[PDB]
Scaffold this motif. Structure first.
Motif, PDB file in Angstrom:
ATOM      1  N   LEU A  99       0.873  -1.024   0.044  1.00 35.36           N
ATOM      2  CA  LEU A  99       0.222  -0.027   0.054  1.00 35.36           C
ATOM      3  C   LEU A  99       0.956   1.279  -0.025  1.00 35.36           C
ATOM      4  O   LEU A  99       0.249   2.385  -0.617  1.00 35.36           O
ATOM      5  CB  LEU A  99      -0.871   0.091   1.292  1.00 35.36           C
ATOM      6  CG  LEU A  99      -1.998  -1.081   1.038  1.00 35.36           C
ATOM      7  CD1 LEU A  99      -2.716  -1.231   2.284  1.00 35.36           C
ATOM      8  CD2 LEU A  99      -3.263  -0.643   0.182  1.00 35.36           C
ATOM      9  N   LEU A 100       2.029   1.360   0.625  1.00 33.14           N
ATOM     10  CA  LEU A 100       2.792   2.282   0.830  1.00 33.14           C
ATOM     11  C   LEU A 100       3.869   2.214  -0.437  1.00 33.14           C
ATOM     12  O   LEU A 100       4.535   1.261  -0.550  1.00 33.14           O
ATOM     13  CB  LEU A 100       3.717   2.272   2.056  1.00 33.14           C
ATOM     14  CG  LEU A 100       4.811   3.558   2.144  1.00 33.14           C
ATOM     15  CD1 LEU A 100       3.989   4.714   2.170  1.00 33.14           C
ATOM     16  CD2 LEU A 100       5.540   3.165   3.414  1.00 33.14           C
ATOM     17  N   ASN A 101       3.729   3.176  -1.377  1.00 34.86           N
ATOM     18  CA  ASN A 101       4.427   3.104  -2.739  1.00 34.86           C
ATOM     19  C   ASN A 101       6.005   3.243  -2.550  1.00 34.86           C
ATOM     20  O   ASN A 101       6.684   3.965  -3.300  1.00 34.86           O
ATOM     21  CB  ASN A 101       3.826   4.056  -3.801  1.00 34.86           C
ATOM     22  CG  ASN A 101       4.358   3.710  -5.111  1.00 34.86           C
ATOM     23  OD1 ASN A 101       4.614   2.649  -5.351  1.00 34.86           O
ATOM     24  ND2 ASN A 101       4.579   4.959  -6.008  1.00 34.86           N
ATOM     25  N   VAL A 102       6.725   2.350  -1.698  1.00 31.50           N
ATOM     26  CA  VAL A 102       7.855   2.415  -1.567  1.00 31.50           C
ATOM     27  C   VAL A 102       8.482   0.799  -1.717  1.00 31.50           C
ATOM     28  O   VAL A 102       7.604  -0.021  -1.365  1.00 31.50           O
ATOM     29  CB  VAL A 102       8.446   3.073  -0.205  1.00 31.50           C
ATOM     30  CG1 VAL A 102       7.761   2.069   1.025  1.00 31.50           C
ATOM     31  CG2 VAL A 102       9.749   3.216   0.082  1.00 31.50           C
ATOM     32  N   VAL A 103       9.863   0.676  -2.351  1.00 42.28           N
ATOM     33  CA  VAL A 103      10.298  -0.602  -2.345  1.00 42.28           C
ATOM     34  C   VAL A 103      11.297  -0.649  -1.287  1.00 42.28           C
ATOM     35  O   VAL A 103      12.314   0.068  -1.126  1.00 42.28           O
ATOM     36  CB  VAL A 103      10.985  -0.634  -3.933  1.00 42.28           C
ATOM     37  CG1 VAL A 103      11.664  -2.077  -3.857  1.00 42.28           C
ATOM     38  CG2 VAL A 103       9.916  -0.510  -4.911  1.00 42.28           C
ATOM     39  N   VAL A 104      11.225  -1.844  -0.381  1.00 41.20           N
ATOM     40  CA  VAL A 104      12.019  -2.241   0.615  1.00 41.20           C
ATOM     41  C   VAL A 104      12.808  -3.351   0.751  1.00 41.20           C
ATOM     42  O   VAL A 104      12.528  -4.635   0.251  1.00 41.20           O
ATOM     43  CB  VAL A 104      11.252  -2.239   1.961  1.00 41.20           C
ATOM     44  CG1 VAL A 104      12.028  -2.210   3.171  1.00 41.20           C
ATOM     45  CG2 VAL A 104      10.154  -1.167   1.956  1.00 41.20           C
ATOM     46  N   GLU A 105      13.933  -3.438   1.314  1.00 39.86           N
ATOM     47  CA  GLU A 105      14.994  -4.382   1.342  1.00 39.86           C
ATOM     48  C   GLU A 105      15.105  -5.045   2.704  1.00 39.86           C
ATOM     49  O   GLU A 105      15.245  -4.158   3.557  1.00 39.86           O
ATOM     50  CB  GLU A 105      16.298  -4.119   0.682  1.00 39.86           C
ATOM     51  CG  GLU A 105      17.379  -5.271   0.368  1.00 39.86           C
ATOM     52  CD  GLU A 105      18.285  -5.123  -0.037  1.00 39.86           C
ATOM     53  OE1 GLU A 105      19.134  -3.951   0.045  1.00 39.86           O
ATOM     54  OE2 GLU A 105      18.609  -5.681  -1.382  1.00 39.86           O
ATOM     55  N   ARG A 106      14.999  -6.232   3.054  1.00 39.83           N
ATOM     56  CA  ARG A 106      15.116  -6.707   4.350  1.00 39.83           C
ATOM     57  C   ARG A 106      16.681  -6.416   4.781  1.00 39.83           C
ATOM     58  O   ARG A 106      17.847  -6.276   4.054  1.00 39.83           O
ATOM     59  CB  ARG A 106      14.866  -7.950   4.414  1.00 39.83           C
ATOM     60  CG  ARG A 106      14.564  -8.546   5.710  1.00 39.83           C
ATOM     61  CD  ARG A 106      14.161 -10.086   5.860  1.00 39.83           C
ATOM     62  NE  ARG A 106      13.213 -10.369   6.913  1.00 39.83           N
ATOM     63  CZ  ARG A 106      13.515 -10.084   8.492  1.00 39.83           C
ATOM     64  NH1 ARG A 106      14.435  -9.226   8.668  1.00 39.83           N
ATOM     65  NH2 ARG A 106      12.689 -10.501   9.299  1.00 39.83           N
ATOM     66  N   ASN A 107      17.002  -6.283   6.089  1.00 39.15           N
ATOM     67  CA  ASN A 107      18.298  -6.069   6.762  1.00 39.15           C
ATOM     68  C   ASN A 107      19.080  -7.124   6.182  1.00 39.15           C
ATOM     69  O   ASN A 107      18.712  -8.373   5.786  1.00 39.15           O
ATOM     70  CB  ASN A 107      17.990  -6.289   8.348  1.00 39.15           C
ATOM     71  CG  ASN A 107      19.373  -6.509   8.802  1.00 39.15           C
ATOM     72  OD1 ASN A 107      20.410  -5.868   8.756  1.00 39.15           O
ATOM     73  ND2 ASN A 107      19.411  -7.618   9.618  1.00 39.15           N
ATOM     74  N   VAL A 146       4.863   9.733  -2.539  1.00 35.90           N
ATOM     75  CA  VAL A 146       5.030   9.567  -0.996  1.00 35.90           C
ATOM     76  C   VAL A 146       5.996  10.850  -0.714  1.00 35.90           C
ATOM     77  O   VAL A 146       7.187  11.086  -1.280  1.00 35.90           O
ATOM     78  CB  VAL A 146       6.092   8.316  -0.806  1.00 35.90           C
ATOM     79  CG1 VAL A 146       5.852   7.269  -1.737  1.00 35.90           C
ATOM     80  CG2 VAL A 146       7.198   8.440  -0.434  1.00 35.90           C
ATOM     81  N   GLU A 147       5.760  11.200   0.462  1.00 30.77           N
ATOM     82  CA  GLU A 147       6.247  12.310   0.942  1.00 30.77           C
ATOM     83  C   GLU A 147       7.511  11.960   1.955  1.00 30.77           C
ATOM     84  O   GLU A 147       7.182  11.162   2.837  1.00 30.77           O
ATOM     85  CB  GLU A 147       5.602  13.480   1.683  1.00 30.77           C
ATOM     86  CG  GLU A 147       6.237  14.508   2.643  1.00 30.77           C
ATOM     87  CD  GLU A 147       5.181  15.350   3.624  1.00 30.77           C
ATOM     88  OE1 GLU A 147       3.959  14.918   3.325  1.00 30.77           O
ATOM     89  OE2 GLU A 147       5.606  16.527   3.926  1.00 30.77           O
ATOM     90  N   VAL A 148       8.730  12.274   1.519  1.00 31.01           N
ATOM     91  CA  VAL A 148       9.919  11.897   2.685  1.00 31.01           C
ATOM     92  C   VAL A 148       9.920  12.597   3.631  1.00 31.01           C
ATOM     93  O   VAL A 148       9.984  13.876   3.733  1.00 31.01           O
ATOM     94  CB  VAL A 148      11.036  12.084   1.905  1.00 31.01           C
ATOM     95  CG1 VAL A 148      12.359  12.025   2.685  1.00 31.01           C
ATOM     96  CG2 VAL A 148      11.305  11.384   0.739  1.00 31.01           C
ATOM     97  N   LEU A 149       9.718  12.111   4.770  1.00 28.63           N
ATOM     98  CA  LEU A 149       9.491  12.791   6.275  1.00 28.63           C
ATOM     99  C   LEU A 149      11.144  12.961   6.952  1.00 28.63           C
ATOM    100  O   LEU A 149      11.263  13.893   7.800  1.00 28.63           O
ATOM    101  CB  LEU A 149       8.822  12.080   7.182  1.00 28.63           C
ATOM    102  CG  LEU A 149       7.172  12.419   6.977  1.00 28.63           C
ATOM    103  CD1 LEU A 149       6.418  11.744   7.850  1.00 28.63           C
ATOM    104  CD2 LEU A 149       7.018  13.982   6.984  1.00 28.63           C
ATOM    105  N   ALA A 158      12.050   7.480   7.051  1.00 31.27           N
ATOM    106  CA  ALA A 158      10.462   7.636   7.447  1.00 31.27           C
ATOM    107  C   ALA A 158       9.817   8.551   6.228  1.00 31.27           C
ATOM    108  O   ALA A 158      10.290   9.495   5.845  1.00 31.27           O
ATOM    109  CB  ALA A 158      10.531   8.777   8.708  1.00 31.27           C
ATOM    110  N   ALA A 159       8.904   7.849   5.811  1.00 33.55           N
ATOM    111  CA  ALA A 159       8.004   8.205   4.631  1.00 33.55           C
ATOM    112  C   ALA A 159       6.468   8.447   5.169  1.00 33.55           C
ATOM    113  O   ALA A 159       5.977   7.558   5.609  1.00 33.55           O
ATOM    114  CB  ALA A 159       8.213   7.448   3.598  1.00 33.55           C
ATOM    115  N   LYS A 160       6.010   9.252   4.300  1.00 32.04           N
ATOM    116  CA  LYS A 160       4.409   9.395   4.307  1.00 32.04           C
ATOM    117  C   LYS A 160       3.638   9.564   2.993  1.00 32.04           C
ATOM    118  O   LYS A 160       4.188   9.926   2.115  1.00 32.04           O
ATOM    119  CB  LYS A 160       4.216  10.665   5.039  1.00 32.04           C
ATOM    120  CG  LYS A 160       2.697  11.006   5.383  1.00 32.04           C
ATOM    121  CD  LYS A 160       2.650  12.458   6.145  1.00 32.04           C
ATOM    122  CE  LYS A 160       1.252  13.037   6.017  1.00 32.04           C
ATOM    123  NZ  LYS A 160       1.127  14.319   6.944  1.00 32.04           N
TER     124      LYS A 160
END
Length: 196
Positions: A99-107, A146-149, A158-160
């Protein structure tokens, strides 16, 4: 008053609930899908990415979490919670809510060098915020919506995005509740628009 929930299927919830209360609002340890109708917003605590995934499934949580999302109810994904809420790499295994339009990588760091603290500059907060990074996931890319917080060493931490809020650090593991307050402000903003 508001009532923020905390998906308690896995990980620790004790500290997020204290944070929510500290900000003057009710906190409910959501352990069953139906309880989602009882809260104004939800906090995905995270902790262990893969674990929480199989847990939400044997507990029929996915579909309800999407209906929760469609109702415009605010969701805050912290640490592993960020993974559940966002999208994974190009052809990664099996995504999550996305739902949050960001791509994430695990630790990827080992058990002995996976933690550290760092003063952060968070949009909305004046004085610096101390982020507790523990096996933090890394945001590789964020959409134009997405706004970078906040950012640290060039990485988005932290993104919004509208009703969604994500961060790779542990805001609850401190005595500073300002970030939780940002989410609580988001949920009230939601209460002031939801026709019920």
């Amino acid at each position: 008053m508001l009532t923020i929930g905390v998906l308690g299927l896995q990980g620790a919830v004790r500290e997020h609930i204290h944070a929510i209360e500290a900000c003057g609002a009710a906190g409910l340890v959501v352990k069953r899908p139906e309880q989602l109708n009882e809260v104004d917003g939800l906090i995905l605590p995270g902790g262990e990415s893969t674990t929480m995934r199989r847990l939400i499934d044997t507990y029929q949580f996915m579909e309800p979490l999407r209906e929760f999302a469609a109702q415009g109810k605010p969701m805050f994904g912290t640490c592993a919670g960020l993974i559940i809420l966002a999208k994974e790499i190009a052809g990664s295994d099996n995504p999550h809510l996305g739902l949050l339009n960001v791509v994430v990588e695990r630790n990827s760091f080992g058990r002995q060098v996976d933690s550290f603290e760092a003063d952060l500059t968070i949009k909305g907060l004046d004085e610096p915020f101390t982020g507790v990074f523990i096996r933090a996931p890394h945001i590789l890319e964020a959409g134009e919506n997405v706004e970078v917080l906040s950012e640290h060493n060039g990485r988005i931490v932290a993104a919004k995005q509208g009703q969604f809020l994500g961060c790779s650090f542990h805001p609850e593991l401190t005595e500073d509740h300002r970030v939780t307050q940002l989410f609580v402000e988001m949920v009230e903003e939601y209460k002031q628009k939801a026709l019920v």
